Ligand binder design. Structure first.
Ligand SMILES: [Ca+2]
Length: 320
């Protein structure tokens, strides 16, 4: 124990799609991360928002997080917070930073689809193929019940279709127009923006990193293969002990065939760029970024717990 991660302002971890603080009140979303940070002197709060919803609008995840932020401030006596989001959580964090600039000290996004996901486009394209539209309704009803049952508080505010739509590349472009940020580069440039933003007397430190385990390889007329760089080829035990490893490799192959380039299974390198990009070299798939499942990762993957701990220290040294 020490003060290595003792930031001035409390850290709030913000989960993405399907998330909650504890799956079924048992499995921590941010596996072993809250415990690690607290041990190093950090004050950390884990948000519990709708696993399936849009970020904007009444009852959206953005208004839920804003309300949680104010509750943490009142309880801590703190005046600002440091937001750290994973996946869609990064978009929710941007929402709070935009509507309540004075309550935010920094925004860090990990594997966040700032420009949307080619995979969401794919799933949405599939649904639209049913001429009767029944597929959408049935699947929606099933995913929605799933969210209520896995939510640690059995939150009934779930809308799988809104969530899907929010993650498409077309919708993300509109979100960016509605909630602009100095941390974003020009649409379609695959570039980041500025390292900070001054939102009316309030300065925010902006950071981001992405995992690029899935890399495109050779190809034929219309077929691009991929390789999972986080693992030792075929015999890595992570292929066996963590079911998400191969699952993201597969999802990642669909991504590459949709022109995404380097990705973590669901988010491309270009889509995740935001603020000061600390790294896009991590050999991680989407769940490795949050030390899942149960702390398993390929033999070539960096330690996500260490990375996050180091960032809490960088925040301390930066003055937040
Ligand atoms: Ca993993």
């Amino acid at each position: 124990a020490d003060n290595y991660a003792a930031t001035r302002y409390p850290i709030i971890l913000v989960h993405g799609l399907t998330g909650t603080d504890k799956y079924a009140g048992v499995l921590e979303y941010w596996y072993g991360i809250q415990e690690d940070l607290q041990q190093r002197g950090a004050t950390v709060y884990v948000a519990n928002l709708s696993g399936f919803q849009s970020d904007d609008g009444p009852n959206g995840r953005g208004e839920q997080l804003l309300a949680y932020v104010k509750t943490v401030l009142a309880a801590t006596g703190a005046t600002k917070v440091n937001l750290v989001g994973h996946s869609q959580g990064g978009l929710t964090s941007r929402y709070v930073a935009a509507v309540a600039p004075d309550l935010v000290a920094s925004v860090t996004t990990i594997g966040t689809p700032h420009r949307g996901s080619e995979f969401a486009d794919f799933v949405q394209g599939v649904l639209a193929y049913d001429p009767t539209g029944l597929s959408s309704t049935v699947i929606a009803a099933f995913v929605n019940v799933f969210g209520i049952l896995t939510s640690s508080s059995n939150n009934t505010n779930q809308d799988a279709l809104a969530a899907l739509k929010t993650l498409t590349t077309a919708q993300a472009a509109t979100y960016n127009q509605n909630y602009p940020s100095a941390g974003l580069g020009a649409p379609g440039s695959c570039q980041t923006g500025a390292p900070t933003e001054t939102v009316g007397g309030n300065t925010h430190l902006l950071y981001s990193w992405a995992g690029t385990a899935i890399q495109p390889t050779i190809s034929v007329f219309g077929v691009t293969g991929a390789t999972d760089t986080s693992t030792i080829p075929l015999v890595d035990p992570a292929n066996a002990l963590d079911p998400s490893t191969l699952a993201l490799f597969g999802t990642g192959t669909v991504m590459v065939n949709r022109g995404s380039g380097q990705n973590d299974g669901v988010v491309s390198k270009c889509s995740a760029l935001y603020g000061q990009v600390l790294s896009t070299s991590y050999k991680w798939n989407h769940l490795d970024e949050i030390n899942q499942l149960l702390g398993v990762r390929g033999a070539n993957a960096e330690d996500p717990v260490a990375v996050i701990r180091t960032h809490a220290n960088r925040l301390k040294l930066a003055g937040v």
